Symmetry: C2
Subunit: 130 residues, 2 copies
């Protein structure tokens, strides 16, 4: 009955958007274990771009989030089938094609982003009144 959900990401400057996505992942089934994977500094810079917080800082914030049950930090940049077997993962949860193989296998669960809620946008809210 317990379903293992894997949600990976950078989780830089964690904000309400991240938190709601993690809540969604956690609640995909009645009884879950939500494993969160946190990408390495080098790979994030190489493949995505600038990261503000270090891996250690990004991982630390996630320890305080209600929905997070387990953490893999650093996690691999690319999810593989071998990874799913290694950690006994039933579904990968991510915003929604690098995930076509997961959809084909029945192992992809879409989660949604929330706009306008990022730490970034809140400094813009301050500077807009300044």
């Amino acid at each position: 009955k317990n379903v293992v959900i894997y949600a990976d990401g950078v989780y830089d400057m964690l904000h309400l958007g991240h938190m709601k996505q993690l809540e969604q992942a956690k609640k995909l089934f009645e009884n879950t274990t939500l494993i969160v994977g946190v990408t390495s500094d080098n790979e994030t810079k190489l493949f995505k771009g600038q990261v503000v917080q270090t891996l250690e800082e990004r991982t630390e914030t996630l320890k305080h989030i209600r929905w997070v049950d387990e953490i893999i930090s650093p996690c691999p940049w690319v999810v593989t089938p071998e990874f799913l077997e290694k950690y006994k993962i039933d579904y990968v949860a991510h915003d929604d094609d690098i995930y076509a193989w997961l959809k084909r296998a029945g192992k992809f669960k879409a989660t949604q982003r929330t706009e306008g809620v990022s730490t970034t946008d809140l400094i813009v809210r301050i500077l807009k009144n300044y």
Copy 2:
């Protein structure tokens, strides 16, 4: 055996410092209920100063924090003895004299702030590399 802990605050732009204080409050005894009080917009502006996020925004983030069991939002600006009886609160947890009456009653629990971890300081980290 269950102990009711009350931690009030503004919780503006919630950061790791807030989260660690909430963790400390939650862990003051073996079995607790941690009630978090969130100050109103008007009273925060009147008595403390500028607030970036609205009461609704500040309350919403706290729903995602592992350590938070119950929320009073808005909460009163000043804790009273009548408040402690109303909500069956055993201890007030706060950074550490408006709290001398709580210490005299045996109902004050100190929690510690963490410096350099605020959302504020992370934008300064970006702008410092710019």
